[PDB]
Design a protein around this ligand. Sequence first.
Ligand SMILES: *Cc1cc2c(cc1C)nc1c(=O)[nH]c(=O)nc-1n2C[C@H](O)[C@H](O)[C@H](O)COP(=O)(O)OP(=O)(O)OC[C@H]1O[C@@H](n2cnc3c(N)ncnc32)[C@H](O)[C@@H]1O
Ligand SMILES: OC[C@@H](O)[C@H](O)[C@@H](O)CO
Ligand SMILES: [Cl-]
Length: 414
Amino acid sequence: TVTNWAGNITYTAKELLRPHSLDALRALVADSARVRVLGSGHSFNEIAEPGDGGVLLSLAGLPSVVDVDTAARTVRVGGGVRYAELARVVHARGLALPNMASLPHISVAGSVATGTHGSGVGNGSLASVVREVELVTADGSTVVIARGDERFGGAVTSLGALGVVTSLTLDLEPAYEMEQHVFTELPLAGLDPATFETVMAAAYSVSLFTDWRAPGFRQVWLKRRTDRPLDGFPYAAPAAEKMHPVPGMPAVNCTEQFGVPGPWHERLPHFRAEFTPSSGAELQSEYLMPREHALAALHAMDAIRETLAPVLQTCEIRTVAADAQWLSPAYGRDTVAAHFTWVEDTAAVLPVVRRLEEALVPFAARPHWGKVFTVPAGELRALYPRLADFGALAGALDPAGKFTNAFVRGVLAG
Ligand SMILES: *Cc1cc2c(cc1C)nc1c(=O)[nH]c(=O)nc-1n2C[C@H](O)[C@H](O)[C@H](O)COP(=O)(O)OP(=O)(O)OC[C@H]1O[C@@H](n2cnc3c(N)ncnc32)[C@H](O)[C@@H]1O
Ligand SMILES: OC[C@@H](O)[C@H](O)[C@@H](O)CO
Ligand SMILES: [Cl-]
């Protein structure tokens, strides 16, 4: 029996395949009628489900390649490699990524497939650093698509619906140091658009957290580059203690605070690489909207906070720079993201998700493809200007829909 990380999704397991060579992988794909790839299982819905008849394919049995070209400042990484390993290797060569997700133990291919991002107003999504993807397509042939190709905008954030991504090449920068400064009790009252932008721009990456109980925000996390200036932060009080994003959880699990300098890859995530949970008692949703709607969205959430709070562990507010990828929730517009880590109870949570989606409809809110959402397919298709172009690319590379399951079919058709 195969489950996702949160344990709310159990897959229909005809067979799980774990090839040990590319030769074996190509033959298995060509010989199978329906395939979905399983990454690290950090999605919260049926996106990785093959359905009956279909095969679930993992890259865990392949050599986990991490090939840093220091001259070119690039790294070539296998489809199943996770960020924690990637980051350690690139750091040891004196290089770095521009951003990371909250927890590093997640597959690179699976991360970019759904629109994974961190925070920072000038920082693009995790997909934005990819310069090339290598795909094993439905007939077992390899197709390489790189920045500049007409098809590239559909090739990185692809919901795994084009084929098996066996390697990706990423752009790198020189290694840098960071400090993390946490603050408590930022009011929502009197926050204007200018002060909101000032707060979110106050360091390289900034997150707000709240429990939607007492008015305002519980915490502000500033992740600052030591090679950039830090101005006084008058808007909230400095934390007296080490904090966890989720009130009442162990702060030992989190990356170092109190402004202590350390390497990028030990400061961008919220959770220490030593923290290796094999499952989590949580559900997640996130909605990504035009940045200009930030204050209006925050006030809509505040007005229904009594509905949100009872089923909420924590809510995180972030920013993302406009993305070139057609299916990125951050496609074509500078973005504000509102993330919800819920309690595990699906029956209690879904009615609240529906209400939240009702409150965010005037703000063109796109849900994160890897998280829980109930936005109807027709509505969903309308939120993505280039969704049609992705549909044509899938039909071209996979005309029999080998890599389409119920989730992808519903999205495209559906
Ligand atoms: C669990 C979790 C999730 C998470 C997070 C922290 C935790 C503990 N922090 C996030 C953050 O800070 N920002 C963000 O935007 N998202 C964050 N998430 C979500 C997570 O990154 C995503 O849901 C991500 O897609 C999970 O990837 P993973 O690889 O674990 O998931 P999967 O269900 O098995 O696969 C997801 C999709 O990708 C396709 N896939 C995977 N590998 C391939 C390859 N090699 N080739 C083609 N497609 C691939 C799957 O088929 C599926 O569609
Ligand atoms: O996108 C997921 C979020 O970043 C969570 O990890 C919160 O930080 C805490 O639940
Ligand atoms: Cl307030």
